Amino acid sequence: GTILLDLAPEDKEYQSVEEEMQSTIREHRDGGNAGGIFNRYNVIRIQKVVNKKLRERFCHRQKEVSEENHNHHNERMLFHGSPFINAIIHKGFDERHAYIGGMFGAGIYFAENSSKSNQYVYGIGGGTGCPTHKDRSCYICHRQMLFCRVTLGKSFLQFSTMKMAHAPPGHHSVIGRPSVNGLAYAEYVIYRGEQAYPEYLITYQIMKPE
């Protein structure tokens, strides 16, 4: 199955991952309703996800995408947050659990900003918050998000991605780009679970502002 390898805080890989997370905290126009109010994270664990079967499916797909994108697979390290982390790290991402509805197409979404992904940790718009206190801004309960390897290949740019079922012909991913009456930040979407590898499992808590 999967093997989770703990990284030590003195390891530069650990430091690297935490910096990208802490440094990509942004202002969200919702007053912190979805992800909570914080200026910082308390990263309490970072585990490397080792799964040979998964890495091989990922690499094989990366090869097909390459063939179709003039030999560039176009890999990008992005964040993902959702209530299904434990399923993802063991079974990998699966498009079959992605459905067209609301503001989402039938794909798997990613963000370059950790605070964006944080908003989805407990569900769309934060859902009802943590399981124990039903608090979207809970500072007690431990949250988890993934910093993943995402194969974007040839991306199709657009303003909305809510009614997509697959990437457009000739493409392998879709990026919802910013717009005045639309998105505030870009969102990266894949429609095949094997186009993303859950490299890092980050366990953390948002911290209250001091």
Ligand X SMILES: N#Cc1ccc(O[C@H]2CC[C@H](NC(=O)CCSc3nc4ccccc4c(=O)[nH]3)CC2)cc1
Residue ranges that bind ligand X, judged by CB under 6 A: 79-82, 84, 87-88, 91, 93-94, 97-98, 104, 108-111, 116-117, 120, 187
141 in a known ligand binding site: yes
Contact between 133 and Zn ion by CB under 5 A: the answer reads yes
Does residue 59 have a known ligand-binding role?
A: no
- Phi and psi torsions of 150, nearest 5°: -120, 125
Task: Using alpha carbons, list the distances in angstroms from residue 73 to 23, 64, 165, 195.
Answer: 26, 8, 21, 10
Exposure on the CB side of residue 55, measured as CA atoms within 13 A = 10
- Which of the choices Zn ion, ligand X, none does residue 133 contact, using the CB cut-off of 5 to 8 A by kind? Zn ion
Residues between 140 and 179 that touch Zn ion (CB under 5 A): 140-141
Whether 186 contacts 64, CB under 8 Å: no
Q: How many CB atoms lie within 10 A of CB 165?
A: 12
Q: Is 206 in the site for Zn ion (CB under 5 A)?
A: no
In angstroms, the CA 103 to CA 202 distance is 26
Is 148 annotated as belonging to a binding site? Answer: no
Under 8 Å between Cβ of 200 and 147: yes
**Which of these segments, 100-108, 118-126, 134-142, 190-198, binds Zn ion (CB under 5 A)?**
134-142
Q: Output 139 or 185, the one with its CB closest to ligand X.
A: 185
Question: Least distance (Å) from ligand X to the CB of residue 203?
Answer: 16
Residue closer to Zn ion, measured from CB, 8 or 140: 140
Rounded distance between C-alpha atoms, residue 127 and residue 97, angstroms: 17
Structure tokens at 158: 């657009």
- DSSP class of residue 124 equals G
| Residues 6+ away with beta carbon under 8 Å from 11 | none
Min dist. Cβ of residue 153 to ligand X (A): 18
Residue number, 46 or 174, with CB nearest to ligand X: 174
State yes or no: 138 annotated in a binding site. yes
Q: Please state the closest distance from residue 141 (CB atom) to ligand X, in A.
A: 18
Contact pick of 106, 108, 138, 164 for Zn ion (by CB under 5 A): 138
Rounded to whole angstroms, the Cα distance separating 137 from 35 reads 6
Annotated binding site for Zn(2+): 130, 133, 138, 141
Which residues contact Zn ion by CB under 5 A? 130, 132-133, 138, 140-141
